[PDB]
Amino acid sequence: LSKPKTARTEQSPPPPSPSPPPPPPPSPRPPSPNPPSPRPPSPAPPSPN
Amino acid sequence: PVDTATLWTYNIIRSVPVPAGGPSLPILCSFWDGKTGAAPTTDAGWAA
Ligand SMILES: *[C@@H]1O[C@H](CO)[C@H](O)[C@H](O)[C@H]1O
Ligand SMILES: *[C@H]1O[C@H](CO)[C@H](O)[C@H](O)[C@H]1O
Ligand SMILES: *[C@H]1O[C@H](CO)[C@H](O)[C@H](O)[C@H]1O
Ligand SMILES: *[C@H]1O[C@H](CO)[C@H](O)[C@H](O)[C@H]1O
Numbered sequence A: 001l002s003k004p005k006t007a008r009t010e011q012s013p014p015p016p017s018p019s020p021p022p023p024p025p026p027s028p029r030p031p032s033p034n035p036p037s038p039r040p041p042s043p044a045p046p047s048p049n
Numbered sequence B: 001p002v003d004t005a006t007l008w009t010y011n012i013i014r015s016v017p018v019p020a021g022g023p024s025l026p027i028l029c030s031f032w033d034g035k036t037g038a039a040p041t042t043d044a045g046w047a048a
């Protein structure tokens, strides 16, 4: 070869930069609703006379 | 002839292969050409 290995004046290039991190786990889920509020008392019948 | 370069090529072999999942084993080869001063006599000189 024309110019031998002793005449290679270039400088070596850096290593590969690292690989990116992984994605996150899917977030949880908003708390589910509550069961319908219980109805009120029921008015007793007419008072006697 | 005097005052020309010359290519010294070294090939190194390890008894056990580097672990497959681990990083590369990084080596620093310190070299004394055999004609200049008396060569380092301690590992500190080789590492310098
Ligand atoms: C309430 O209903 C379901 C589960 O009960 C859903 O996953 C959410 O937790 C919320 O919307
Ligand atoms: C690093 O790479 C360059 C090639 O550009 C050169 O061969 C150096 O000798 C090597 O150490
Ligand atoms: C990523 O790292 C490599 C070497 O580890 C190199 O320096 C790149 O320039 C950097 O972006
Ligand atoms: C992710 O990226 C780096 C280079 O950026 C390298 O290729 C790793 O092998 C890959 O996992």
Ligand SMILES: *[C@H]1O[C@H](CO)[C@H](O)[C@H](O)[C@H]1O
Residues within 6 Å of the ligand: A024, A025, A026, A027, A028
């Ligand atoms: C919901 O939770 C996930 C984590 O699993 C994500 O990182 C964010 O905190 C949010 O999108």
Ligand SMILES: *[C@H]1O[C@H](CO)[C@H](O)[C@H](O)[C@H]1O
Residues within 6 Å of the ligand: A039, A040, A041, A042, A043
């Ligand atoms: C009366 O009590 C509740 C309401 O207060 C409900 O409607 C019942 O059906 C009734 O008995």
Ligand SMILES: *[C@H]1O[C@H](CO)[C@H](O)[C@H](O)[C@H]1O
Residues within 6 Å of the ligand: A044, A045, A046, A047, A048
């Ligand atoms: C008639 O009924 C009412 C309900 O509020 C009450 O019990 C009285 O004592 C009765 O006279």
